[PDB]
Amino acid sequence: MSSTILVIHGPNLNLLGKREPEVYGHLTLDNINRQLIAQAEQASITLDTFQSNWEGAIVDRIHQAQTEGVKLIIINPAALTHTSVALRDALLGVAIPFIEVHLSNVHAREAFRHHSYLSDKAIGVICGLGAKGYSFALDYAIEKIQP
Amino acid sequence: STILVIHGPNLNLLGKREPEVYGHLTLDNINRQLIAQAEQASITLDTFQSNWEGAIVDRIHQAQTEGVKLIIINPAALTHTSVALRDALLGVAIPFIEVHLSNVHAREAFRHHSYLSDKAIGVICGLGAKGYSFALDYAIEKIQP
Amino acid sequence: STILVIHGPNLNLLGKREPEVYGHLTLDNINRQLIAQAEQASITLDTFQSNWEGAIVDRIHQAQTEGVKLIIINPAALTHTSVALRDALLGVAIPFIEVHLSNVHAREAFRHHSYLSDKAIGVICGLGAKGYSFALDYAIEKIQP
Amino acid sequence: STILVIHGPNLNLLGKREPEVYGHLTLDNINRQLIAQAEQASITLDTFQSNWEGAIVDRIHQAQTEGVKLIIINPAALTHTSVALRDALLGVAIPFIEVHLSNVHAREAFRHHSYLSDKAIGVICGLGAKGYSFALDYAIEKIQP
Amino acid sequence: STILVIHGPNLNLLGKREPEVYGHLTLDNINRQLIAQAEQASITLDTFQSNWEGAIVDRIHQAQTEGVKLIIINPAALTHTSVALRDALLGVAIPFIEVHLSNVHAREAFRHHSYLSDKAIGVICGLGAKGYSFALDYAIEKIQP
Amino acid sequence: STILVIHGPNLNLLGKREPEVYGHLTLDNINRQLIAQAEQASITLDTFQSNWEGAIVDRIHQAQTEGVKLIIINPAALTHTSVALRDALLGVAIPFIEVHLSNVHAREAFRHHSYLSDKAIGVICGLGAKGYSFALDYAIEKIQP
Amino acid sequence: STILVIHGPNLNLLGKREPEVYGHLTLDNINRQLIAQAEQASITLDTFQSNWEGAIVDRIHQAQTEGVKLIIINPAALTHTSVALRDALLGVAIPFIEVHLSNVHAREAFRHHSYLSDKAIGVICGLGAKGYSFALDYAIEKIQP
Amino acid sequence: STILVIHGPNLNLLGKREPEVYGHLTLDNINRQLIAQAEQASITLDTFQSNWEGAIVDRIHQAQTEGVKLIIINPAALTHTSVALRDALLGVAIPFIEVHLSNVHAREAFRHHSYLSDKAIGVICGLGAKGYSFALDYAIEKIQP
Amino acid sequence: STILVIHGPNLNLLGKREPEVYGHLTLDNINRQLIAQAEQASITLDTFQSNWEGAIVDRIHQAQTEGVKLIIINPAALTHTSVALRDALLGVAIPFIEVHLSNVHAREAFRHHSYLSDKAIGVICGLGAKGYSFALDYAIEKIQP
Amino acid sequence: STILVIHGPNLNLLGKREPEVYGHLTLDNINRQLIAQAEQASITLDTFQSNWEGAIVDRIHQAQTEGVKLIIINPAALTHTSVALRDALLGVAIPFIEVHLSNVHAREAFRHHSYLSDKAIGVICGLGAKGYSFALDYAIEKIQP
Amino acid sequence: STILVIHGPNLNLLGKREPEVYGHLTLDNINRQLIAQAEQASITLDTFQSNWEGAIVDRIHQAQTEGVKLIIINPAALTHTSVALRDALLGVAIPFIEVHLSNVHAREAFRHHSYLSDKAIGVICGLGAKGYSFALDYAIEKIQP
Amino acid sequence: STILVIHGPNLNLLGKREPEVYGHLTLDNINRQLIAQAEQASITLDTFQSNWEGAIVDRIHQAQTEGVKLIIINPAALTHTSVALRDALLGVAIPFIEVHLSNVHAREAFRHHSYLSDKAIGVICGLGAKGYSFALDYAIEKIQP
């Protein structure tokens, strides 16, 4: 249809809260989505979400966003951040600026996770603050679009 | 007790080209071999192949809901490139064994790095199709002594 | 004899995002011209674009089945990252020419490395849509001298 | 203090040169906003800035004595250079959030390496002054039930 | 409007030794072809070859006085070593297309880096003589739309 | 037809410190399993262990003058350090299969590199002692179908 | 017009260790010479030395408020380590010349890298005290045509 | 005084936060022990700690004027970052012994590198408080044979 | 043997190599001094030297069974090359201290690396023969408070 | 002659195209200024420029037979590639100062390395033509105090 | 010519500067000795020296037209830089032995790389002038057993 | 006595596997030639070969006490791994020439690095068994000019 913000979630994040809950909390992707949908609605901003484990699905969704009139994308590419040049060219290709978000501190883990094909082109980046990182990106986008 | 064999991209091509230069062994040959071996020891064994990274990730996820207890995976070229495959296998926490037909260490330098090997139980490479069989032998004996 | 021309991810945006930013030609324009050129030399020419690696890998496997003699391929981003794509081209043993509209060596440091270039016949970067025509020119003269 | 905010070297220069170059917003404005944001949640917040590494390390030792529960630190250039600052934070074991006005990844490559980011709870870069608010929003959620 | 085609060191040997090694094609054959194509568009086309970096640098300075609009260069070995040549081409500010007969990415690692590729309009490698004629083609359209 | 099994330095300590560290299983147990498995298939089998690189290199030269058809080797630490061992194996042209009890990819970075893996038929790390068995089972089929 | 000369850490020791190691050329001598030189063109010249990175950064910040037209700086050690100094010079936007008594390229490898040189107008190294003079001469020229 | 002990940043924390994790030993305890050992030898021993790199350089220069014969220095984090500290010790030409409480090699890779180690007499890491005593012991024998 | 002191290759040469440039103290002299210090603390001490890697490994295994509580080792050249030496010390689980006569950081860059440093309690280098005394001294305190 | 100024490749372009782009200052004007400055102090000064590396090496050899005491060399691009030129200046043992008109450190990364700088007395880069004047001033001063 | 000796840049200096310090031997003497040695074997030997890369490359082309059977070359500094020299030698396909008067492995790091060594028959370095005689001895033995 | 020829590991296999691979030339053939050649000049020549790093180190220590003036050594695989062997040669301070039968530079990348070449008088590789003769020839004129 049309939606001012677009939240994207990369591969594996559908698994939030589905293992032994005693391992990574009880907070699910749908919990996160509800929260972002509420927040956006309280500001009278249209918002839309997408998640997939398939890179070209995400790439298609980004192309579709250009036609739907999206102004900002909030993206947690999960593992795609270290590997996907197509993802970066898609974002650049459509010239929709974006904020990169990670639930975990990516700098605290393996060394290959320090490198990102997206960070240098983001407005900015939030890693390690869990769910609230998405909320903060939204907070920031709402202030850029409708002061 | 279910085991899942995941074959990665391009493995469906086994045998097609020229059987004389490259062997006559197909992807189904290998599957029939392991299905037989797993019936012999009364294990439920399931198998999967795809050229699409996303299909494989959706397959590892389904494996958690199905109560799989070990994955024997030959990720082919995805061994060198996919963090998404690692984070699936770790996310669902089914232990795995990495297998390759050919000796990856004897080829281009870039084939010497893996995003999977460090998190497998173990790795067999360069022993042809019997390497899958050895993985399943390890798996049968780990799962039901 | 068939030549297949393959466009990698994002090349479907050609033209659409900012006429000002890049060459007015669109992906369909490029494909029209190419077909016409190969009709003018009596050669069957199929085309294909996808944003999904596995879709491209599948297309290459089919190309073997269809008896395609040469692949002209612009992998776009996948040149820097896809070993799957490499092993599909190598596996079916169809020769290929790599094309890019822009000069990759002028862009960021990571775009200087390829998983395809070293196994291509040659490469053409930075000469815009004519890169495709030159590749095709070269392919016609290889097949029917 | 419950929250201490620390600003590294050259942050005092915000807004000073050419008020039509990088905005009018000063360090004192930023501080003003954070003290009031924390007044609104009945949290006591202090702030500190210096161009001298040693003064910052002293300030962090004093935070331990003052009973500070969390530190919000934009270490500026010292992110890339100062192991002493990392060891001041580990030694007093006060958790911290790292904050950067600009996007250090968009800047030249020596600025992609940090000595603090791995030991932080999290990091916020490139959202300008609102980065500090977000840090403070998180810290308040974490400290009061 | 004049195009200048420069040929680097050792290219004078083309087709001179065991014409079953790198073919029967000579340097002078490449030039007949290019002059044919340039005359056919009524464009003046001059050619040059030497094994001496200086003769090439001087030749590029002369091109500036002669009103050369575009240069087609196969630097050969100099592509990997000559900053002097990069600086001449830049000093005179005449746009250039880099051309190599063979696939430079298929040979040793030291041949993958170039002191010119990043400042060229674009690059052609791997397609023999035709790579030159493709560059000329593009040059003629650039000068005479 | 003889197979020689070769264990490198430190493997003589298997199950020699606190039976709760790496099982009850000793180096002798492994050899026994392996000589038994080889009696079953009428293959004669020789074993050898040493902490001394030169003793192992003499053992490999010895294998040549005894007509040993294949070598199963766990070079332990020497996999990362000894080009003398590589050149021993290459020098006598006896095929080998490299085996490790642990997953060497799951350890320190320096254990990723190897002076043997690229010249072996293939490699098995991480499957415990069953690794040696599996290499034997492969060795037996190649030597007598 | 003010010109600021800054001398970094350890430059206070010039001439103090051994009546020969690099002359009796002391810091006061150098400063006096520079003060004389600037007088003769009615330039106000400030000097400043410290062993504390943060005092040097303060001093450059104070330059902006003094309307300083150009800085002549010898950061000693701090060239190779201080990102704060770089961001100070850039934040205030006063152009500077980098000066070094010794030839930093003649010594250990770690002295070849500088966090300043790329942002300086230019650099003089290896020419002893006179480099400060040359830098001044240049500064006088650039400020008063 | 004859001997100077310099303690770098954060060493004032020794035995504060968590008595149990790093034990009950303080920096005052270490200085008490060392002063008393120097008293048995009739050698004068001064001590110094600071969080500020400039204080530490200033105290080294000040050591030259006091006729200090040898310096036992524990730079803590500054060992990996500070060339100004190197150049201070080299400038005053007072030989020195680097001491560290913890095993610096057992920790993150960045801690293995140092700007002082190659210019010390020797280095003691990992042996706790006794490390300073051993260096003082050695230093006493260098001045009292 | 409560303490075992091991010396690696080439250390047997201390002394006779022209004892006026590098002079006098021999390996036997260091052992006398060591054995005397241990008698004086009523603790038993064995010593070992060899130029054969395998023999030093063999001794470290014999130290497990002899009940040695702590190893003091100067591997000399083996510290840079031998991961078998590392794995044997880990195998037997005997805590150790690494000693070098000379400052290893003051020489060639290859000598900066060690396969033992990070698993030693501590390291002492550059302080000549007294570095073994210091190590012994420390060990005596650890085994007998 | 007493002093020799050597200009490398491309420097003959100065002020020839779009003189405003980089200044109405020709190599000829620089030489004129230099010759007069030398004449002021009764020093004879020969000048030289080439684009041919061999011409420059012959000339440096000729300087030895002519008794040249010091060379001032702007090697331009040859600073990054030519070890022959390094070896020419060393073989004849004439000290030299390196000059560049632009800040080479501000450019592409491959210009950070030089085969001359470490053996020059010093280096001046970024100061335009005045760099050569400063070199000469220094040279004149050292040759006749 | 049957054999051709080639001397690269700067070798013409041999024995021309303070011969009692840098040694008496000239290039003419080396040539005189190889021409006599060749005379004894009834082999014709020519010799060439130049400081110009392109002169050397031209001479290697001519060698082909003269039917030279083996080249002995001391490329001197060009060994580290000239890809054009390697492609000349490979392009005419005349086998060659690389010689160096001095041990290049004893010099700076960058004298470790060579663009020719790996395509030579072999290499002799550091045996002075006799290096050339041994190359000639080997060469006479190869052309006529 | 006086001259000693050392062969490293695996050279005992010369000639022995398949007389039509690398020739019929044995380690004895080599030694005999060298012994005759040295008899002809009134020098006694020793020879020694081992597959054990320590036998070689011992042999070198022995050579010190037998008044050996020069070593000719082919360390074979040990050139790339043994610091111990380097430290022996330097320890006893007997000059040495490094020899290899094959062009070590034409093989794998790891074989370019050596822990010996930089300390040898010179090095000869790729000239077969004559390399030894050439090294002896040189050695004789060094000992008996």
Curated annotation (Swiss-Prot), chains B, C, D, E, F, G, H, I, J, K, L:
<dbReference type="GO" id="GO:0009073">
    <property type="term" value="P:aromatic amino acid family biosynthetic process"/>
</dbReference>
<feature type="binding site">
    <location>
        <position position="80"/>
    </location>
    <ligand>
        <name>substrate</name>
    </ligand>
</feature>
<dbReference type="GO" id="GO:0003855">
    <property type="term" value="F:3-dehydroquinate dehydratase activity"/>
</dbReference>
<protein>
    <recommendedName>
        <fullName>3-dehydroquinate dehydratase</fullName>
        <ecNumber>4.2.1.10</ecNumber>
    </recommendedName>
</protein>
<feature type="active site" description="Proton donor">
    <location>
        <position position="100"/>
    </location>
</feature>
<dbReference type="InterPro" id="IPR036441">
    <property type="entry name" value="DHquinase_II_sf"/>
</dbReference>
<comment type="subunit">
    <text>Homododecamer.</text>
</comment>
<dbReference type="Pfam" id="PF01220">
    <property type="entry name" value="DHquinase_II"/>
</dbReference>
<feature type="binding site">
    <location>
        <position position="87"/>
    </location>
    <ligand>
        <name>substrate</name>
    </ligand>
</feature>
<feature type="binding site">
    <location>
        <begin position="101"/>
        <end position="102"/>
    </location>
    <ligand>
        <name>substrate</name>
    </ligand>
</feature>
<keyword id="KW-0057">Aromatic amino acid biosynthesis</keyword>
<comment type="pathway">
    <text>Metabolic intermediate biosynthesis; chorismate biosynthesis; chorismate from D-erythrose 4-phosphate and phosphoenolpyruvate: step 3/7.</text>
</comment>
<feature type="site" description="Transition state stabilizer">
    <location>
        <position position="17"/>
    </location>
</feature>
<dbReference type="InterPro" id="IPR001874">
    <property type="entry name" value="DHquinase_II"/>
</dbReference>
<comment type="similarity">
    <text>Belongs to the type-II 3-dehydroquinase family.</text>
</comment>
<keyword id="KW-0028">Amino-acid biosynthesis</keyword>
<feature type="active site" description="Proton acceptor">
    <location>
        <position position="22"/>
    </location>
</feature>
<keyword id="KW-0456">Lyase</keyword>
<dbReference type="GO" id="GO:0008652">
    <property type="term" value="P:amino acid biosynthetic process"/>
</dbReference>
<comment type="function">
    <text>Catalyzes a trans-dehydration via an enolate intermediate.</text>
</comment>
<dbReference type="GO" id="GO:0009423">
    <property type="term" value="P:chorismate biosynthetic process"/>
</dbReference>
<feature type="binding site">
    <location>
        <position position="111"/>
    </location>
    <ligand>
        <name>substrate</name>
    </ligand>
</feature>
<dbReference type="InterPro" id="IPR018509">
    <property type="entry name" value="DHquinase_II_CS"/>
</dbReference>
<dbReference type="GO" id="GO:0019631">
    <property type="term" value="P:quinate catabolic process"/>
</dbReference>
<feature type="binding site">
    <location>
        <position position="74"/>
    </location>
    <ligand>
        <name>substrate</name>
    </ligand>
</feature>
